Symmetry: C2
Subunit: 281 residues, 2 copies
């Protein structure tokens, strides 16, 4: 039976997610279409999230991903939501069952967590700094503290954003795992930490540079980056030069799709194939 | 680029159209999903036609087919309608362009016409009787009189339905091509005609039998049938026994999809492949 999926969000032209799902469905013998549903684009602009979700239900979609700015807004519209997505307050994956009812999940969390396992298997996790509370920073922080990080300091230009994220995560896990810290002087905090993750767009071609002064890194740090365009960000280059273990941004981006594909289809995805597709774009 | 299509109508479980489009898209190197959008089914029940059409636009469909009960209702909702579909007052094919605008066509007409060319190439067309004005009977009648039939007599249980169809067709072609005739005593009219087409559901397993007494046929008649479940209807069996040339119902059903696929995709469909898919279900 053919598989029909889509992604509801804004500014979706460069998403690698549609190609990953289309190729893997086909590799498993199932014709698969995965449509961008971009509310800045030529088809869905100006439509409400509920309209688009309902449309997917009526027209036989088997699942959706959800991205900015709808990952929090979508929760109340869904029939069921996983406890993890419920506690984070964000859903990136919606499974649509035969009768058009919906279950929300968050594979950004599971995907980053898998990335940590795959790419940082020996990393010291006692104390970690995350720079950036926006984008997928919420899922990243949640994954960090549920995959071994004892103390996470989250810095954002907007201190209130970092504190809000800290409160959400701490409530979800039931301990004071996360503390908001000032972005100014974050270098000193990183220097004392075991690892640091960039969750800002810094490093992308339209946001060149690094979110902090990389001279504060030492060889003993590990460094992670959410940015995967480019794969080798200035931050990760600087970390690698020192001999730091690194976690690049492709791992989360691939694994969120691996986990979503499994949820959408009940098939076991081939990670290496989905990684190949991801890198080919 | 992957292709996304659907069919809006009621009672669509046994449609062979989705499989034909999915297989041909894939045969041409394009992952293709074709969804039933059945307003008696588990996803789209109770939704208005406009809601479903708009949904297709927003979620990136490249085209739709339309069937009962929406082929006339859909016209005013479309941005452009072919002159042929306009004159018949019925659309079965909607091409959705990049900006989400719509062009209506009728490939039931073109499909039956192609069936006549392919299956009745030597047939005498001066005088033809069509039994049934419902279902695709409107498209069939239009095709008949635009592909060489000089006089078409359309009989229906509901005489007003046959007369309404006659008026539509005559207006479309600009001559008195069609006349409504009584269903009672239709045997005498058929006996005097060159050919007869069944456009009722008679012959299907839930409507067994024939729409008229086949003893009125002679070897010189040709006989056509809209029914393709079964392919060899009691009517067509009786015609074949006499040595009549016959036109079975698979030709229209396949060619409407051939022509729609070309319209949806700009690709030249392989008729033999689509016929193979059709017969395999």
């Amino acid at each position: 039976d053919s598989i029909l999926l889509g992604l509801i969000g804004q500014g979706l032209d460069l998403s690698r997610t549609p190609a990953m799902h289309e190729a893997e469905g086909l590799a498993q013998g199932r014709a698969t279409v995965y449509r961008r549903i971009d509310t800045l684009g030529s088809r869905a602009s100006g439509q409400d999230l509920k309209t688009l979700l309902d449309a997917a239900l009526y027209l036989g979609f088997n699942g959706l991903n959800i991205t900015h700015p709808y990952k929090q807004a979508v929760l109340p519209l869904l029939d069921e939501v996983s406890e993890q997505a419920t506690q984070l307050g964000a859903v990136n994956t919606v499974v649509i069952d035969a009768t058009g009812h919906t279950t929300g999940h968050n594979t950004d969390v599971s995907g980053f967590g898998r990335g940590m396992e795959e790419g940082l298997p020996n990393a010291k996790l006692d104390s970690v700094v995350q720079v950036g509370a926006g984008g997928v920073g919420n899922a990243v922080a949640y994954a960090l503290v549920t995959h071994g990080v004892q103390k996470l300091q989250v810095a954002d230009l907007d201190t209130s954003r970092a504190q809000a994220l800290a409160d959400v995560i701490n409530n979800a896990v039931g301990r004071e795992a996360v503390v908001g810290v000032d972005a100014r002087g974050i270098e000193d905090v990183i220097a004392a930490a075991d690892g640091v993750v960039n969750a800002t767009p810094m490093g992308m071609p339209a946001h060149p540079g690094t979110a902090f002064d990389v001279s504060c890194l030492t060889k003993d740090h590990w460094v992670g980056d959410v940015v995967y365009m480019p794969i080798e960000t200035e931050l990760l280059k600087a970390a690698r030069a020192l001999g730091c273990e690194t976690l690049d941004g492709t791992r989360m981006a691939i694994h969120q799709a691996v986990d979503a594909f499994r949820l959408f289809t009940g098939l076991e995805p081939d990670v290496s194939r989905m990684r190949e597709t991801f890198l080919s774009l």
